[PDB]
Design a binder for this molecule. Structure first.
Ligand SMILES: [Cu+2]
Ligand SMILES: [Cu+2]
Ligand SMILES: [Cu+2]
Ligand SMILES: [Cu+2]
Ligand SMILES: [Zn+2]
Ligand SMILES: [Zn+2]
Lengths: 157, 157
């Protein structure tokens, strides 16, 4: 027996480095929204750039996930900007205890269609996203979030 | 600017353990076929069970990828059997040099639709798949391929 297409209603990405452990779950909710929730330990307190990159390709570590998932051909942006990339989910915040609570809802990423992020990569950044609001010349493209301290492919949960 | 859906025409999964390194690329080819190619080092010579498991979930390591990708509700099988699971890609073979060449074409897995494996998991097994042809009582369900020495999520390449 052969079926039509089912859109997954939940996905997850797993970050594990020597220092870093995190699960980030992405759950399809009402009104074309996705509910992104997880928690990650292992960075000092502060803000770090958190994005979906285009490729679920780890053959070159985080470098192979390429650039920010951008099907709408827009500029780098704040998640609340109209001019953002689909993958531009802003900054995560590590507390004094070295633990990030992730808990947000984004109306641009999806679990299917042209904004589908299944098979794409979550990338955690070593410093903070600037929202394309600086005059570093990367700022309009990548924010300016430094290296890529961790990444994992978005899988079906 | 907003787009219709594009089906990815290439995917990859990356196996890296303390001992194991491998890339496996999955490429959409003519005639509803997928061309699976890679190479993996780090096991002695022999046959090991190589499958697509249902979930791209690594939160529980390889255990969370669940069971064999099976949307057609069939039994475990040889890739050439009609009665197989979609995820039942048989055995890989490590040479005396500890290196697996993977190079095959499978007509059941796809990169989209109900047999879409993007976001699902490649799982490498510690011993060999028996093709559901034994009388171990797992044989009809999992073949009988032992533990799960490595796994990676299928990402968009
Ligand atoms: Cu980034
Ligand atoms: Cu376009
Ligand atoms: Cu298996
Ligand atoms: Cu069914
Ligand atoms: Zn961006
Ligand atoms: Zn099977």
């Amino acid at each position: 027996m052969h079926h039509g297409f089912t859109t997954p209603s939940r996905a997850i990405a797993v970050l594990s480095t020597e220092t870093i452990r995190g699960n980030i779950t992405f759950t399809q909710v009402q009104d074309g929204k996705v509910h992104v929730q997880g928690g990650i330990t292992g960075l000092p307190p502060g803000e770090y750039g958190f994005h979906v990159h285009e490729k679920g390709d780890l053959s070159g570590g985080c470098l192979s996930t390429g650039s920010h998932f951008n099907p709408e051909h827009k500029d780098h942006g704040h998640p609340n900007d109209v001019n953002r990339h689909v993958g531009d989910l802003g900054n995560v915040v590590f507390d004094e205890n070295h633990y990030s609570r992730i808990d947000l809802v984004d109306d641009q990423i999806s679990l299917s269609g042209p904004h589908g992020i299944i098979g794409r990569a979550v990338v955690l950044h070593e410093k903070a996203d600037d929202y394309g609001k600086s005059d570093h010349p990367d700022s309009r493209k990548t924010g300016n979030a430094g290296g890529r301290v961790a990444c994992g492919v978005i899988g079906i949960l």
